[PDB]
Amino acid sequence: ETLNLQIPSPTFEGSTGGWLRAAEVEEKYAITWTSPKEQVFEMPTGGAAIMRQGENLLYLARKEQCLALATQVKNSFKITDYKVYRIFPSGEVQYLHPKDGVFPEKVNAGRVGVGNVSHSIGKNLNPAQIKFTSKSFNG
Amino acid sequence: DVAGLTPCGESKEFARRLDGSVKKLQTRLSKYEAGTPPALALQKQIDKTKNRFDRYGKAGLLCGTDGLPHLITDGRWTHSGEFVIPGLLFLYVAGWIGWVGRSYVLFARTADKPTEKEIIIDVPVALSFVSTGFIWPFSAFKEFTSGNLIVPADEITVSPR
Amino acid sequence: SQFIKPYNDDPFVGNLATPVSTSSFTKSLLSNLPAYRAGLSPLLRGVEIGLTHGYFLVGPFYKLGPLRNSDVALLSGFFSALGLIVILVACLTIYGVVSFEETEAKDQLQTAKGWRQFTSGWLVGSVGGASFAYILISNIPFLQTAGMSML
Amino acid sequence: MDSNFLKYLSTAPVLFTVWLSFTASFIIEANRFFPDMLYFPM
Amino acid sequence: VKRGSKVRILRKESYWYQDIGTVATIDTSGIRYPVVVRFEKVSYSGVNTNNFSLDEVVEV
Amino acid sequence: SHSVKVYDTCIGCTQCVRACPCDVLEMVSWDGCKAGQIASAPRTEDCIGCKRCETACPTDFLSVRVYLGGETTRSMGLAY
Amino acid sequence: KKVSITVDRDPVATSFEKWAQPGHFSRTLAKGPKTTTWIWNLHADVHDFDSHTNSLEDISRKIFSAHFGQLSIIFLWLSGMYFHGARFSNYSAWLSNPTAVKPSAQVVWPIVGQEVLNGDVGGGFQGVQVTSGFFQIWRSSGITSEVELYWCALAGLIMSGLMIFAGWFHYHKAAPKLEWFQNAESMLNHHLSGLLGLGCLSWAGHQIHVSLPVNKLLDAGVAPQEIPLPHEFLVNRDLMAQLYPSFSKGLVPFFTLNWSEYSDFLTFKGGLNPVTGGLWLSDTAHHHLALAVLFIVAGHMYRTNWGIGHSMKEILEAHKGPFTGEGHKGLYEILTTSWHAQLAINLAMLGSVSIIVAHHMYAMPPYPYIATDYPTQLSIFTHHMWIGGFCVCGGAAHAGIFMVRDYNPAQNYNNLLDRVIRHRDAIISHLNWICIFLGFHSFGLYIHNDTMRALGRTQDMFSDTAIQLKPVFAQWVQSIHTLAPGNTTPNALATASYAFGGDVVAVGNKVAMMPISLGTADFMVHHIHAFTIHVTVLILLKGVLFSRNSRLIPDKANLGFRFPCDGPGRGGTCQSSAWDSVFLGLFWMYNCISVVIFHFSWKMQSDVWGTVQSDGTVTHITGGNFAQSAITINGWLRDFLWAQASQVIQSYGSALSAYGLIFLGAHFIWAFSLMFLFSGRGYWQELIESIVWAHNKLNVAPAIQPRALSITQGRAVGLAHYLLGGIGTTWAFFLARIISVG
Numbered sequence A: 001e002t003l004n005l006q007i008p009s010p011t012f013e014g015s016t017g018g019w020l021r022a023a024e025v026e027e028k029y030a031i032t033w034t035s036p037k038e039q040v041f042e043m044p045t046g047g048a049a050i051m052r053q054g055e056n057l058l059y060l061a062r063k064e065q066c067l068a069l070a071t072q073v074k075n076s077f078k079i080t081d082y083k084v085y086r087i088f089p090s091g092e093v094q095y096l097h098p099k100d101g102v103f104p105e106k107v108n109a110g111r112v113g114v115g116n117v118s119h120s121i122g123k124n125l126n127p128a129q130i131k132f133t134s135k136s137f138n139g
Numbered sequence B: 001d002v003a004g005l006t007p008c009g010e011s012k013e014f015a016r017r018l019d020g021s022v023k024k025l026q027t028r029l030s031k032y033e034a035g036t037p038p039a040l041a042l043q044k045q046i047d048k049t050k051n052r053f054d055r056y057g058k059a060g061l062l063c064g065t066d067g068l069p070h071l072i073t074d075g076r077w078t079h080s081g082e083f084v085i086p087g088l089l090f091l092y093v094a095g096w097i098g099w100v101g102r103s104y105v106l107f108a109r110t111a112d113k114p115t116e117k118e119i120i121i122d123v124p125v126a127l128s129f130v131s132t133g134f135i136w137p138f139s140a141f142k143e144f145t146s147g148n149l150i151v152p153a154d155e156i157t158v159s160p161r
Numbered sequence C: 001s002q003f004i005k006p007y008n009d010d011p012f013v014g015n016l017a018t019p020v021s022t023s024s025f026t027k028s029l030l031s032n033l034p035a036y037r038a039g040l041s042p043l044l045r046g047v048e049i050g051l052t053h054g055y056f057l058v059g060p061f062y063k064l065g066p067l068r069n070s071d072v073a074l075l076s077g078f079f080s081a082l083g084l085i086v087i088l089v090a091c092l093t094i095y096g097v098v099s100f101e102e103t104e105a106k107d108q109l110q111t112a113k114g115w116r117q118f119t120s121g122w123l124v125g126s127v128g129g130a131s132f133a134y135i136l137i138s139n140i141p142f143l144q145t146a147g148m149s150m151l
Numbered sequence D: 001m002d003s004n005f006l007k008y009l010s011t012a013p014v015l016f017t018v019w020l021s022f023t024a025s026f027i028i029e030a031n032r033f034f035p036d037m038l039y040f041p042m
Numbered sequence E: 001v002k003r004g005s006k007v008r009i010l011r012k013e014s015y016w017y018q019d020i021g022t023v024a025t026i027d028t029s030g031i032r033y034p035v036v037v038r039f040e041k042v043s044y045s046g047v048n049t050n051n052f053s054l055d056e057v058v059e060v
Numbered sequence F: 001s002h003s004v005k006v007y008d009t010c011i012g013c014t015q016c017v018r019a020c021p022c023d024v025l026e027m028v029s030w031d032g033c034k035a036g037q038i039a040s041a042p043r044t045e046d047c048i049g050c051k052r053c054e055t056a057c058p059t060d061f062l063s064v065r066v067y068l069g070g071e072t073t074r075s076m077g078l079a080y
Numbered sequence G: 001k002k003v004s005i006t007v008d009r010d011p012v013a014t015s016f017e018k019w020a021q022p023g024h025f026s027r028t029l030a031k032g033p034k035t036t037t038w039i040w041n042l043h044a045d046v047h048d049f050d051s052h053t054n055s056l057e058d059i060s061r062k063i064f065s066a067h068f069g070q071l072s073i074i075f076l077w078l079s080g081m082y083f084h085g086a087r088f089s090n091y092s093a094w095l096s097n098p099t100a101v102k103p104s105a106q107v108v109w110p111i112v113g114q115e116v117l118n119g120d121v122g123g124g125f126q127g128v129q130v131t132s133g134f135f136q137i138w139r140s141s142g143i144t145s146e147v148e149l150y151w152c153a154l155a156g157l158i159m160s161g162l163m164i165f166a167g168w169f170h171y172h173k174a175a176p177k178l179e180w181f182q183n184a185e186s187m188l189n190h191h192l193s194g195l196l197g198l199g200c201l202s203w204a205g206h207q208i209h210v211s212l213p214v215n216k217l218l219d220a221g222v223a224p225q226e227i228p229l230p231h232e233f234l235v236n237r238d239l240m241a242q243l244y245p246s247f248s249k250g251l252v253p254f255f256t257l258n259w260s261e262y263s264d265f266l267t268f269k270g271g272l273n274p275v276t277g278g279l280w281l282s283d284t285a286h287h288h289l290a291l292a293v294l295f296i297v298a299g300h301m302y303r304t305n306w307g308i309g310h311s312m313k314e315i316l317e318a319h320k321g322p323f324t325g326e327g328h329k330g331l332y333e334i335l336t337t338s339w340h341a342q343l344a345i346n347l348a349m350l351g352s353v354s355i356i357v358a359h360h361m362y363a364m365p366p367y368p369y370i371a372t373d374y375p376t377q378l379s380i381f382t383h384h385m386w387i388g389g390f391c392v393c394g395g396a397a398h399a400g401i402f403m404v405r406d407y408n409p410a411q412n413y414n415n416l417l418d419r420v421i422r423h424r425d426a427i428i429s430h431l432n433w434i435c436i437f438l439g440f441h442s443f444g445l446y447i448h449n450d451t452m453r454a455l456g457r458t459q460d461m462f463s464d465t466a467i468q469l470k471p472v473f474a475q476w477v478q479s480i481h482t483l484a485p486g487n488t489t490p491n492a493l494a495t496a497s498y499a500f501g502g503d504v505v506a507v508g509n510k511v512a513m514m515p516i517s518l519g520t521a522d523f524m525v526h527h528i529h530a531f532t533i534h535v536t537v538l539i540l541l542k543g544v545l546f547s548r549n550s551r552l553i554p555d556k557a558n559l560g561f562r563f564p565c566d567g568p569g570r571g572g573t574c575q576s577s578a579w580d581s582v583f584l585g586l587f588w589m590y591n592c593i594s595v596v597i598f599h600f601s602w603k604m605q606s607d608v609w610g611t612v613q614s615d616g617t618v619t620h621i622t623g624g625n626f627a628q629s630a631i632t633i634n635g636w637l638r639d640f641l642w643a644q645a646s647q648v649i650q651s652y653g654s655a656l657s658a659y660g661l662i663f664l665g666a667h668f669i670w671a672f673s674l675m676f677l678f679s680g681r682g683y684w685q686e687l688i689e690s691i692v693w694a695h696n697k698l699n700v701a702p703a704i705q706p707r708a709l710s711i712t713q714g715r716a717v718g719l720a721h722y723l724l725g726g727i728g729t730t731w732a733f734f735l736a737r738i739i740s741v742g
């Protein structure tokens, strides 16, 4: 499950759009995927890189940067084998996406609904009702 | 006269406006020979200027201290040709355009595809409608009273507040 | 032959190794410069940077200042340089207070004690460099002019 | 005359430009023969 | 209501509140909004149809 | 972070989750709609607030509702 | 013979059916409107051919026929200028007395008192004074008759009919295949050799056989009806040899390479004709003959069907060094498969050429009596500055469209584009720094001078009387160009332009051209120019380089070239598209070009234009106030805008009252634009909801539901009205000012 740090990376001639000091002091994101070919893709941070046949590893500064490459790899090269991780400066590796092995767009058992409101949006409480009280505006 | 104004026919400032306006054109006419096309054009401009001032003087308009005609629009009948009567002509034409357009949008709603009738106008039907506008005050008041102009408040989309 | 490579042999870092960024001449100059010099105390780093900056600050204030045409142009220029040094040393002090949490180690600029030592050195160097510029310009007539003394 | 060319001349920009040019044209002609009408004459 | 009937929307936050649409289908399960109403006017989103409950819909 | 809510008018079309660039939304089983599923937001800390989920929502009033709140490095879209 | 003509015959049927179905060209719009946004979306995407069709062949065919339609419109426009010169002009009166009669080719009808616009332009004529310089073109052509202007109007009309026929024919009857359009070597050979080269050769031939004899007779003092007709020079070689004795030897000196015989009519004089204040037409004839030879020679560079020539792919792929990776590999594939890449290059070049045209045409006036017609000089400079700036921003617009749409990373690995996108942060940060440095060190000098002058400290300013920022390099280059005749251009007789130094050329006691001295004010306004050009480059480049992705939006190419935002999140991504950098850079182009035309207008009036008094003193139009007053912003406000706006404000009741009306109308339109620029769509949609309610109440709601304009369209409408209002304000101000005083 855990990120194999030794995964080889795509051939990129470098760019100025990559990650800055906050990646080494706050958080860094990594994306891995398996490619059947030695093919050119576009980096979210700049120009073009070549993903290697076999397993690739990337280091990006944002989760949207990782998910942008994930969509490019799924719509143009049909890779569904992408795992997105958040790597703390402490060295902790946090797996992110897909969070339970199944894509968010597919239903999965054991998922608990968060943020779900039992009524429609027009039944939200008016702000005057919730003023000077801790009671929430979603009913 | 009204509002301390003077009739334009006896105000000296209107007369000096006419005289100065004709002197400007006569000094432009003084640099051309008699039969030339610019001189003929300038003389017709002088004739139009004199006709305008002559007509305004005998029209019952009231001039200011500046010698320009002023319009009295308080409703008095001795000055109704400056706003009340031109306004009645406007409201007749404006209500014509409004009644004709309203009749066409109500026709276009009953079409097979209502929105093509508004970018590609059914010109024979729309010309039937432009002919309808001459009796719009009666047509629209009968429309109003027969419950066909105003829709009830519970048939109109409104915001939640 | 390629003269531009990924920075630090890391392609996804946000930098490119280039001749301007990573030549041996650039590496030698940065290491030689007091801010990045190895073996240099933070106070000594501040003294060398301060001596440099205070020395060249006097000249624009002296030559182009409001009192430039007056005979007190150098004194005004030195005072203006000194005032700018005091404002900048206040800036260094406040940056040090907010940026760095207090730690025992002082061997680095990026420490509360080290930046305080750096600011101390920068003030001493800047006032000394400004003073050195004042002494030199006052003594040398050519420096008092803009190089037109020969003319 | 072709029905598709007449359906093109019935389009909103063509009718708008022709009708407002006709409208502009009789305002111009009415101000040519009867100029300087500041008032309804009465 | 029933399928194909013309209905007046009573959902205050609807785009077509107090407008007329026509009912396409009504589900029979435990669905929270079974009445599917289609509308001639399109919403700001461009959608011209929405699912509503019975107590948000009146026959005309 | 932002607060993202899903209301029970959700028809389970899965479009808001597909729109999500930051894996904030996912599908959970729900018997309320014909599709048998409703959107959920267990990752609103990654929510940047783009409101692409709202655009993809085909309900008359978006079942998915983003309420922009406290800003973080993640919700500001900062790569620095 | 791999370069061949290949055409599909009868591709598209000439039918009115698609005319009657607006929106037919796209799948979205063809299902009809449901909201009023459709109406706007119809016009917005119509010429976006590569948004409708997948195939490059149909796109290229649509572009070729639309270029013929544009050429038909240009020829109709030219035919109208010739017809208005023939029928509604004082051209014949202007030919007799070019220095007193004012050019006019537009007469108004007397309708609502508007016949005051037929002012007394001279020559027993009343009309609107025209400033396009056509009269000077026609005199340079040797027209000398209104009959020949009618024949030119018919020639333009015939060409307009032939181009509209050719567009119909080449879209509907014989449309070329894609392999025809992808012949860049053949097209370049023909557009260098045939279009530009035979264009110059034929024009040089016309100049030698028509313009040179007629203009020698005109400047000798012969009246226009006493001048022999232009074919009598073609036949009577004896009569042509009276004016130019080299014609006694014919074409033997050309073929025997004895070209110094032709020095009577092929000169290298330089400078201006003293009689007209224009370029020597013998120099212009030699100029066009020399350009024709090089353009024809250039059009033999590329390989088409016989093994001689270059492959442009080989030229590009061979140019690669150690800094630039694979080099120019893949650029030929880009420029023969992307129309937007070609339009980006050609619009940047056409705009640059139009900007070059404005500088060169004022400095070296090329037509007879154009230099002392100051309304024409100001008009054609200002016009070609605006055409240049607009075309340059469209070069960046279509660079953004190329990057968003036609750019493929797979075919662009490690080439020049890949490397630019891979160091775009370094490019934009260094451009950002130079723009901050140059706004501080150009406009802050103005703020320094405003402050010091306001404070009573005139000794503390950047001025010629105080701290002198002299333009030593520009003055030195002026020195070189004044010393160049006889030294570094030994066979030149005069300087390339009198702007560099030298004589004052006066025609009809008005200065044709005279040295433009550069001082502190010129240093300051040139660094203002360098600053405004740099910032326009920064906005346009930042849009091109960040069109596909950023650190902010990593998937910006999926949103497109023209999107409003990607939501209020990430702090807010309003105006994140490449389109919105074209939108923001057209304002800074407006700013740049407005300062350029203001610098030109004030400097030429203050230091160049004016009347030559006895003893050669030149009393200038604004009396040399540029040097001591263009160093402060208050001087630009007071001595340029306030002082020279006198003519537009006081134009009422005269022939220039139309300019006063357009001055006010354009102030109105400019302000009206700010309603679209400072506001947002959501306000207007809720306001429209209340208006829709009032329509619903009267049962008069439209079936095409009214919408507020899109966010992008609100930006585009605001920018279009802003540009129209600002440029129309400057247009009215410039034209009333210089018609009154020059």
Ligand code: CLA
Binding pocket: D014, D017, D018, D021, G076, G077, G078, G079, G080, G081, G083, G084, G088, G106, G107, G108, G109
């Ligand atoms: C292309 C450049 C050009 C320009 C800008 C002008 C401009 C002008 N011309 Mg000139 N003209 C031109 C070319 C041009 N002309 C050419 C090529 C010829 C030779 C045929 C002429 C011959 C000519 C003459 C003989 C005269 C002018 C006159 C005029 C003036 C008024 C014209 C007018 O009011 O028409 C208005 C006429 C109308 C019929 C009104 C137009 C309303 C309709 C609806 C136009 C709509 C177009 C249509 C909707 C497009 C779609 C087609 C349809 C199938 C949908 C104006 C200054 C007049 C002038 O200067 O008098 C002093 C004048 O007498 N022109």
Ligand code: CLA
Binding pocket: G063, G064, G067, G068, G071, G180, G181, G183, G184, G186, G187, G190, G191, G193, G194, G195
């Ligand atoms: C020597 C031959 C030749 C010449 C003169 C031209 C001329 C032109 N081409 Mg090119 N073209 C050529 C060969 C040539 N082409 C070849 C071989 C190809 C295939 C690879 C193309 C492919 C091509 C494309 C794809 C496009 C052009 C376009 C254009 C026009 C550019 C706009 C312009 O400045 O026009 C104004 C200048 C003029 C001189 C207008 C005159 C118009 C005619 C056609 C010029 C020639 C007339 C005749 C030869 C002169 C006889 C002289 C006689 C009186 C003695 C211009 C008319 C563009 C365009 O606008 O399309 C219409 C365009 O998109 N051409």
Ligand code: CLA
Binding pocket: G078, G132, G133, G134, G136, G137, G349, G350, G351, G353, G354, G357, G380, G383, G384, G387
């Ligand atoms: C919106 C477009 C537009 C409009 C309306 C005008 C309008 C005008 N131009 Mg300008 N012009 C424009 C764009 C425009 N220009 C651009 C983009 C360029 C750069 C190529 C120029 C360059 C230009 C020149 C160089 C001259 C004008 C002139 C004129 C005036 C007379 C019109 C005429 O017959 O030209 C006739 C043009 C000539 C008689 C000279 C043409 C010489 C050029 C070099 C021919 C080049 C042709 C070739 C196909 C260009 C290919 C582009 C190249 C980069 C490959 C008129 C004010 C003339 C003027 O101001 O006289 C007072 C003039 O000498 N124009």
Ligand code: CLA
Binding pocket: G043, G044, G045, G046, G047, G048, G049, G343, G347, G390, G391, G392, G393, G394, G395, G397, G398, G401, G561, G562, G579, G582, G583, G586, G720, G724
């Ligand atoms: C040779 C020049 C050239 C060519 C062929 C094109 C072609 C194209 N451009 Mg480019 N562009 C150009 C010059 C050019 N443009 C310049 C000079 C600029 C800078 C202003 C731009 C800026 C630009 C942008 C920012 C965009 C395009 C787009 C487009 C495409 C479709 C445009 C469309 O359908 O509009 C149809 C035409 C109109 C809607 C006309 C309205 C424009 C103004 C408001 C009218 C002007 C009126 C008049 C001049 C002044 C008003 C007078 C008043 C008093 C009555 C098409 C590929 C768009 C696109 O789809 O990208 C693919 C796009 O987003 N271009």
Ligand code: CLA
Binding pocket: G432, G433, G435, G436, G437, G438, G439, G440, G443, G444, G447, G535, G538, G539, G584, G585, G587, G588
């Ligand atoms: C007159 C109004 C005005 C001013 C002053 C500015 C100023 C600036 N713009 Mg803006 N802009 C404006 C109008 C203005 N803009 C408008 C109307 C638009 C409409 C679209 C834009 C669109 C726009 C874009 C799209 C871009 C700019 C950019 C810039 C910067 C240029 C770099 C520069 O010159 O830095 C120098 C700073 C100045 C010249 C500001 C004036 C300061 C003077 C010199 C004195 C300084 C006073 C001093 C600090 C006093 C300190 C004491 C006090 C604090 C107590 C700068 C911040 C560019 C940018 O930021 O990138 C570099 C850029 O890309 N602007």
Ligand SMILES: CC1=C(C/C=C(\C)CCC[C@H](C)CCC[C@H](C)CCCC(C)C)C(=O)c2ccccc2C1=O
Binding pocket: G675, G676, G677, G679, G680, G681, G684, G685, G707, G708, G709, G710, G711, G713, G714, G715
């Ligand atoms: C006024 C305004 C509107 C409302 C404007 C609308 C709905 C335009 C409608 C104007 C009428 C309906 C047509 C305009 C016709 C003009 C008389 C001339 C138009 C010329 C071309 C359209 C042909 C917006 O929708 C908007 C959106 C985003 C930012 C700013 C704004 C904004 O400022």
Ligand code: SF4
Binding pocket: F006, F009, F010, F011, F012, F013, F014, F015, F016, F017, F038, F039, F053, F056, F057, F058, F059, F062, F063, F064
């Ligand atoms: S889009 Fe709206 S409806 Fe479709 S799933 Fe997400 S929330 Fe439920």
Ligand code: SF4
Binding pocket: F004, F019, F020, F021, F022, F023, F024, F025, F046, F047, F048, F049, F050, F051, F052, F053, F054, F066, G569
């Ligand atoms: S806002 Fe953007 S990120 Fe937050 S949920 Fe909706 S889509 Fe996913």
